[PDB]
Design a binder for this molecule. Structure first.
Ligand SMILES: OC[C@H]1O[C@H](O)[C@H](O)[C@@H](O)[C@@H]1O
Ligand SMILES: [Fe+3]
Ligand SMILES: [Fe+3]
Length: 689
């Protein structure tokens, strides 16, 4: 029954002491028990924690990074909240503070004395240094970054730097014999306030710190007027203009724990009791977010409002975000490597068969396009959020998720026509596609109104034509969230492998990966769903009108296909009627949005350009299409894009997910969330929070 104690890892005597006071008062409140382990630097706790020597540590965005690096695989459990009179935030602006009358501008720091909060930290290192890389005139990795900064600045105080091989980096540092340049509050110039003092005491000419830090140390407008901020546009603005004069906006610091068996639950209860009991002004016996004057930010940043729990799937990469991840990864890559990724486009292939085709695409495009792969479509979207991939073609249903996580639709899939190949198709208004409900002419017993208890074949969960649209209309008729009980058995790749929704699914050829939501599951997709019907594994199939047409009458000559006929299948109309597959325009469940490519709003324009070219070269009218590669063909497996795609068109102004999917559907998708939500959906709720 009993659950043990959270072992918090401290980095210096001052920190231990605070921790002890923390344990003391916690037990006195008769709440969750704490324990204080002592190592000598945040870097060390990271190691301690992963080896089960400890359990938790607060870390600045920068260290969360390394903490998440392979050998350690730690993850952010709770993010600190800060308020500098707005909405408390889980982000903060990194700034560069200087005294007035110093003259520099951000592009003239060469030879200046500088004070950093510590090696590896967001505001104090990762961000300023990435901003000044263009002036370091640095080779890249072979050559230690520490070596450049050292030649760049006349002297500095960068706690945690090799004061041995690079003394220039530790030189301004005040500290006793070996306390000098310490990676703890032993070095008086460590941290936001440390770096600030190093500035006010006249040891350095520029302090690289947090937005609040000036206001924290100088409570009077008169004294702050003695200082300014260096804006990235080579001008200087007052200290309360950080909102305009910032080098960057990073994610708050965070409590990290092990990825496996980290006791996230223990840690959260502890912190929830702590805010409640010692948060801002709650108590007087102990203040969690306050420290001694000699040393600031002990255990947590002084004056933080409290914490917010970080959902489960979120790891350090997603927590930090693409913006941050790129700039940090970019301090460990060559100039050529950076510029190279910035000009290519990384597509995210979902599943083995897609990466194959993508690889063909890459080779054939002299690598203007590279690939990235995941087992699922959610994973791809995450990759895109971490910044490891640049885009992918998504179904309306997932354009919703992508949209809720901030991605925007770039171009849309225009199916092969019909009015005139008139324009090209690039300016044709996307006209969407009809979602239908298919069954065999044979079972004539069967009517929409009789699906109850019958077998179902879905393209996959989360998708428009299948799931979203039929389940949307059924939930309306039964008011029941138990989606796994309407149809007797079903195959819907993506569901709980032990639920009836995965009953009819078949996996690859050697019957492995049953129900997985990607090509490897043979009964996956429009094509897969329809087949689940033809092979009589299911009684009704949810797909689009065209899917039948493309696999009957011998068009698809795969064994199970070959013999089928437009004639063998009819659709179930909402009014209990039944029409031939051809009368779909008068017998559909809904009008869906064509699929669409999505990317971060940043990459959109470049993405477009590269795609207009790539499809002009291998598109539906691609000169080298039959010849060397057709981007829109894949042997009816609908890899990367639909096989009937003519071209990727313009959005006609519908540039946001809401605008693109449209009112209705967006709302319908939300009513369905009432029943079930996705972990990705939640992770994004927090990040976009
Ligand atoms: O009426 C259906 C329409 O739905 C959405 O607006 C799609 O973006 C569009 O392509 C489609 O024509
Ligand atoms: Fe920081
Ligand atoms: Fe779809």
């Amino acid at each position: 029954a009993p659950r043990k104690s959270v072992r918090w890892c401290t980095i210096s005597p001052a920190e231990a002491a605070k921790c002890a006071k923390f344990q003391r008062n916690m037990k006195k409140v008769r709440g969750p028990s704490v324990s204080c382990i002592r190592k000598t630097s945040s870097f060390e706790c990271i190691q301690a924690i992963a080896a089960n020597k400890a359990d938790a540590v607060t870390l600045d965005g920068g260290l969360v990074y390394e903490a998440g690096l392979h050998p350690y695989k730690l993850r952010p459990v709770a993010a600190e909240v800060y308020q500098t009179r707005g909405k408390p935030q889980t982000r903060y602006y990194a700034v560069a503070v200087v005294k007035k009358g110093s003259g520099f501008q951000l592009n003239q720091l060469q030879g200046v004395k500088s004070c950093h909060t510590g090696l590896g930290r967001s505001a104090g290192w990762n961000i300023p240094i990435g901003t000044l890389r263009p002036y370091l005139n640095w080779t890249g990795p072979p050559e230690p970054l520490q070596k450049a900064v050292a030649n760049f600045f006349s002297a500095s105080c960068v706690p945690c730097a090799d004061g041995k091989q690079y003394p220039n980096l530790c030189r301004l540092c005040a500290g006793t014999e070996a306390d000098k340049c310490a990676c703890s509050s032993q070095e008086p110039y460590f941290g936001y306030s440390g770096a600030f003092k190093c500035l006010e005491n006249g040891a350095g000419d520029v302090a690289f710190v947090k937005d609040s830090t000036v206001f924290e140390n100088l409570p009077d407008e008169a004294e702050r007027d003695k200082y300014e901020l260096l804006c990235p546009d080579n001008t200087r603005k007052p200290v309360d203009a950080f909102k305009e004069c910032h080098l960057a906006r990073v994610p708050s610091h965070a409590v990290v724990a092990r990825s496996v068996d980290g006791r996230e639950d223990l840690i959260w209860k502890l912190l929830h009791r702590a805010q409640e009991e010692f948060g801002r002004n709650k108590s007087s016996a102990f203040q969690l977010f306050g420290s001694t004057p000699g040393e600031q930010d002990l255990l947590f940043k002084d004056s933080a409002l409290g914490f917010v729990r970080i959902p489960s799937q979120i790891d350090s990469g997603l927590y930090l975000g693409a913006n941050y991840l790129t700039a940090t990864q970019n301090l460990r890559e060559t100039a050529a490597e950076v510029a190279a990724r910035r000009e290519r486009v990384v597509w995210c292939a979902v599943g083995p068969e897609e990466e194959r085709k993508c690889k063909q695409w890459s080779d054939v495009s002299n690598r203007k396009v590279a690939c990235a792969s995941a087992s699922t479509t959610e994973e791809c979207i995450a990759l895109v959020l971490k910044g490891e991939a640049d885009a992918l073609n998504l179904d309306g249903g997932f354009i919703y998720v992508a949209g809720k996580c901030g991605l925007v639709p770039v171009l849309a899939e225009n199916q092969k026509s019909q009015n005139s190949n008139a324009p090209d198709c690039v300016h044709r208004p996307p006209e969407g596609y009809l979602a239908v409900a298919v069954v065999r002419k044979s079972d004539a017993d069967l009517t929409w109104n009789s699906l109850s208890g019958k077998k179902s074949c879905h393209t996959g969960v989360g998708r428009t034509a299948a799931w979203n649209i039929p389940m949307g209309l059924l939930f309306n008729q039964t008011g029941s969230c138990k989606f796994d009980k309407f149809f007797s058995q079903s195959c819907a790749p993506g569901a709980d492998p032990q639920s009836s929704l995965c009953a009819l699914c078949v996996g690859n050829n050697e019957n492995e990966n049953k129900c997985m939501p990607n090509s490897e599951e043979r009964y996956y997709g429009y094509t897969g769903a329809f087949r689940c019907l033809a092979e009589k594994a299911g009684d009704v199939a949810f797909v689009k009108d065209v899917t039948v047409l493309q696999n009957t009458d011998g068009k698809n000559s795969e064994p199970w296909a070959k013999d089928l006929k437009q004639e063998d299948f009819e659709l179930l109309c909402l009014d209990g009627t039944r029409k031939p597959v051809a009368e779909a325009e008068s017998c559909h469940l809904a009008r869906a949005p064509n699929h669409a490519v999505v990317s971060q709003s940043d990459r959109a324009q470049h993405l477009k350009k590269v795609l207009f070219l790539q499809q002009d070269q291998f598109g539906g009218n691609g000169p080298d299409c039959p010849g060397k590669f057709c981007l829109f063909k894949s042997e009816t497996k609908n890899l990367l894009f639909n096989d009937n795609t003519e071209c990727l068109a313009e959005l006609q102004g519908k540039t946001t997910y809401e605008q693109y999917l449209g009112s209705e559907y967006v709302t319908s998708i939300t009513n369905l969330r009432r029943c079930s939500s996705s972990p990705l959906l939640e992770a994004c709720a927090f990040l976009r929070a």
